[PDB]
């Protein structure tokens, strides 16, 4: 509350560390469904169904331009990529499996870097 604060957690490296995580997600062999925005002209149903499209290149541009206020807004966009994937793709599909694999990969890096 006013003039009453928990001890200051050092967040000065968060930007660099989210960049490193994002690099590792970018270079994973199962990243290919997620590297670029879904083409809304060429994929029937996507525009109407997925209210907030997100992809790794969009996260990279947001990260590089100071559009994440803190490390949690960064995690929310990464998770959005996988949530969108599950919304549109069957689990038993190459893309559906890719999304589960990448979500697992991300959540481990996230816990190990920050928790």
UniProtKB/Swiss-Prot annotation:
Q: Can you tell which superkingdom this protein's organism belongs to?
A: Eukaryota
Q: Where in or outside the cell?
A: Nucleus
Q: In which tissues is it expressed?
A: Expressed at varying levels in several tissues, whereas a smaller transcript was expressed specifically in testis.
Domain Bromo, which positions? 9-113
Per the entry, what this protein does is: Regulatory subunit of the ATP-dependent BRF-1 and BRF-5 ISWI chromatin remodeling complexes, which form ordered nucleosome arrays on chromatin and facilitate access to DNA during DNA-templated processes such as DNA replication, transcription, and repair. Both complexes regulate the spacing of nucleosomes along the chromatin and have the ability to slide mononucleosomes to the center of a DNA template. The BRF-1 ISWI chromatin remodeling complex has a lower ATP hydrolysis rate than the BRF-5 ISWI chromatin remodeling complex.
Summarize subunit and interaction data from the UniProt record for this chain: Component of the BRF-1 ISWI chromatin remodeling complex, at least composed of SMARCA1 and BAZ2B, which regulates the spacing of histone octamers on the DNA template to facilitate access to DNA. Within the BRF-1 ISWI chromatin remodeling complex interacts with SMARCA1; the interaction is direct. Component of the BRF-5 ISWI chromatin remodeling complex, at least composed of SMARCA5/SNF2H and BAZ2B, which regulates the spacing of histone octamers on the DNA template to facilitate access to DNA.
What name does UniProt use for this protein? Answer: Bromodomain adjacent to zinc finger domain protein 2B
Q: Which organism does this record belong to? A: Homo sapiens (Human)
Gene name, per UniProt, is BAZ2B
Q: Which residues of the full protein are shown?
A: 2054 to 2166 of 2168
